[PDB]
Design a protein around this nucleic acid. Sequence first.
RNA 1: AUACAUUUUUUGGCACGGACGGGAAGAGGAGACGUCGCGACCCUCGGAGUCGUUCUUGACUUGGUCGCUUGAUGUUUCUUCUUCCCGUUC
Lengths: 75, 81, 82, 135, 44, 65, 70, 212, 78, 69, 75
Amino acid sequence: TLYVSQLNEKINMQRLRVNLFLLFATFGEVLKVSMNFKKQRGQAFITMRTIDQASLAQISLNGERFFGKPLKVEF
Amino acid sequence: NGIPVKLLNEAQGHIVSLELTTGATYRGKLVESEDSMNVQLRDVIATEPQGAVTHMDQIFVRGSQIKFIVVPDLLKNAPLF
Amino acid sequence: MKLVNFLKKLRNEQVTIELKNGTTVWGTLQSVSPQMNAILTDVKLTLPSDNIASLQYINIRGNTIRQIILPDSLNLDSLLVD
Amino acid sequence: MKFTPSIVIDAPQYYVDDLQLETESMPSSLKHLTKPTHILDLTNNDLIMIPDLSRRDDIHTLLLGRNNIVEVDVQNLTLSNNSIRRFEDLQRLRRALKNLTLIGNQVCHLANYREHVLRLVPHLETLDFQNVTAE
Amino acid sequence: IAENKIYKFKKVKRKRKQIILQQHEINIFLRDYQEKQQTFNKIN
Amino acid sequence: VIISLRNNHKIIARVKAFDRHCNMVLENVKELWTEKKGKNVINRERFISKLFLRGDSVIVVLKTP
Amino acid sequence: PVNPKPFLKGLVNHRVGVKLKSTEYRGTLVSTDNYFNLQLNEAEEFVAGVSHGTLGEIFIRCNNVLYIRE
Amino acid sequence: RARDLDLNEIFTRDEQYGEYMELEQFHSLWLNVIKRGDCSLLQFLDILELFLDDEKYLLTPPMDRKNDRYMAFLLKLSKYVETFFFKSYALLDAAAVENLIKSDFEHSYCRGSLRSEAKGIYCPFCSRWFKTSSVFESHLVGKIHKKNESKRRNFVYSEYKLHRYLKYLNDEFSRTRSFVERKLAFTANERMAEMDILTQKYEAPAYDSTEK
Amino acid sequence: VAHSSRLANLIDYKLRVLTQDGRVYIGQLMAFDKHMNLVLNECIEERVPKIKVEKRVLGLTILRGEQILSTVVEDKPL
Amino acid sequence: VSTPELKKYMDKKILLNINGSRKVAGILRGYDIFLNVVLDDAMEINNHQLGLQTVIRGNSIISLEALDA
Amino acid sequence: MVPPINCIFNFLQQQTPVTIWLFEQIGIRIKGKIVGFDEFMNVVIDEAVEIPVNSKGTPLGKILLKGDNITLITS
RNA sequence: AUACAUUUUUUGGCACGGACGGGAAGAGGAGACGUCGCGACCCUCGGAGUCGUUCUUGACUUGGUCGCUUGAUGUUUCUUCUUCCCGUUC
Ligand SMILES: [Zn+2]
């Protein structure tokens, strides 16, 4: 489950989950959790079923431009 | 006893919804429910079948005119089931 | 005395069911409730000039069911016996 | 590994974060799922083209990542990291769709790839995870 | 017919569903048999 | 006998069964109605072998000599 | 003191008229019960007060009754 | 090759995979046409017994043969019994039998294969008799017989088929009549026991785990 | 869907539910009742205006048995 | 069986919504187990009064929304 | 608390003009005097007057009206 | 393999080459009542948490608005044709 931030925080909560569900799909199955509260804006946790599916997801998509902004991933 | 009667009894306190046979949805705090679903609500919004809304304070609703009642998902967990 | 018990003994019969709003329902009565809640299997739904929808399992409510078309070969007198 | 009725029924069918079916040389025998899944997953396979589906009204998302999709024969379509080269191979998407992903393709480095896709396919609202503007 | 044999040996009797199943199964075999035969005449 | 119905079905049939609810088994079943378009005059009717009936739909049972 | 059920039993073998939930009726009452199920002889069917047909011996289901009149 | 071939999609339960053929559903349609309810299920099969003889369906019909509802029912009645014939015997060449009946329909039936010694030669489109073959040949180009052959071509060709296919299914037709005469004289427990066994033949596999 | 004998035995299945006004409810049966009152797990209110199926996601619904026309089984468990 | 608990609503003016998209106003007097409502009469929803006190059948009642809080 | 069972009992001994409305039937109203009392709401109401609703008067005799079609009682 | 139909449930107030579709131009679809979406010279700047008791359980609490320069969608009253381009069927 990889912690990704520095996202464009204008993109809608029903919309932002649906774009993360397709983009991390290549790495593995996706379950993305995020909110719109002031602590949590621009922030997301995508939960992978397989552990190495998260590891391939973080390194290859590091700094990839998403909704205009290059997102930063963590473990 | 009816089991959907008992969960509506558990729905006291929470923010429930209620549409009539006219097609008038409600949303407010469930006060009291009975065997026949004679439900009371507070701080309730009321949508017209055309679409218009009217705020109103304290409604009593006879169960025969109920089409459905929406309960929050927190009552899914405990204790009735 | 009861036609409820007439419905309980009618089993596994490929029947037609007519609803209050006119929907013709081809179905097979596996069991019938005491309050006419007919339980069907291998159902075929047809409207009273419009298209057909086939379905597996449909449990219809009793006040909706206006008329159950009874089957073709059936002795009624032996069924009326208690 | 061919698509068959033995394959699809043992494949995982759980709701994704819509009801999803988890799944290959070429895709076939998609009647056996009986149109019960909206989002599908055909990722990490060797599908050469998206060809031969049945009539599937409920299917709205095709996750076709990490394949060799080089040709075309529905609200969201993820075709990430496939074998598309020519923009004319995208002309069969003209009949289809609000979400499209064709990143990871050799076609993406063609000149005027963004303008050729957005004009011939107007129904797209999101192309390579960027919203299509008026200008 | 009645002893259900062809040259010497009597087989075990089958029910009607397994027979008619094979009668439609040999039917799609004969359709495959004639379909291949048509193209084979159109190449040879 | 002839039976009127809620949705205008003149039901001509033979009575077999009868109860409290006026739930009825019918032999030699003849419903009379009209499925019409706006500005349409058609009398259409059919026969059914055997038919079960619900009692609330019944308005008036009438008996012809 | 005239209650509804002795009046209904009193009005047996007398002319009555029945409106539906809508077509008006006319006939001589045969017998009734507690549930207000009706039986009439010499039925005359008034379609909004217009005599359509003479039905004769009829049987009115209780749920459709709206009033009884002389 | 035959993974998805399902006999439950081709056969029904009231046929028992070609053992019987369901004709109760057509008795339901048959009552709509006759404008009475005096037809029982055995009397309707007795009406279908006219279609076994070469003369009985054609010289003493149930009705007038020019009733619209009667002609509408008999096309469906031809069509199901025709498709039932090819359904129960899938190993036979369909076009070979179909062209055979059409050859017998064109060369013999349309030339007057029904000939009687007192009235002469009968014609199905004309529903009339003819004295000699010279006056029979002289009506085939007349204006009356042009109209009936141009309006009733499909119905008579369907009526000749339902004759010839039911003669091919004579052992099936006698067997269905025995079923009704059995089922009518059942009790409640006897009929409920029978409806189980008929369903179990429908929904159990063609190969058991206990076969040799 | 298997060949079940009563409704109460087929609990926690995904049910399509019709009603008198024209609405179509899809949702998992949590509970049955004597008057066919139904508790639905994730119930989606589906309506067709006089053209295309419109969608409304409700959640946990207590549905009155008076309004229900029929119940059809939509899907498997889980 | 159980009584409709209108003991909060007692002696208060309530808009009693009835069948046919009609509305009845008036101050509450009493009730029974079938939810039939006896009330001192008010106007019918431009606006007009008929009667001194009215008695409402329980089957007619869509709802009863209180005017006083 | 004045119950509706007791309230009809007082109307019978008062013999005052009652106006009854009809259930799911707006345009027609009944105006007469309550005579009967039953365990249900069913009454006999003699010398009644049918009234067409303003969006006049019609002749009408003495009538028992079935209690399921009662909407209002006021006397 | 070992129980009953007269107000809250079910006895209901129910019923009455030829076509298609989308988009645009022109000639003789429109006015409002609410809902949420695209852009922003605007605002705004970062099932879960805690305790009591015991080796596992109980209680208490929890995007706003402006434009649309042709954004989608329901009630409620009144009164379409010709051409061009795209796709389906014969
Ligand atoms: Zn001739």
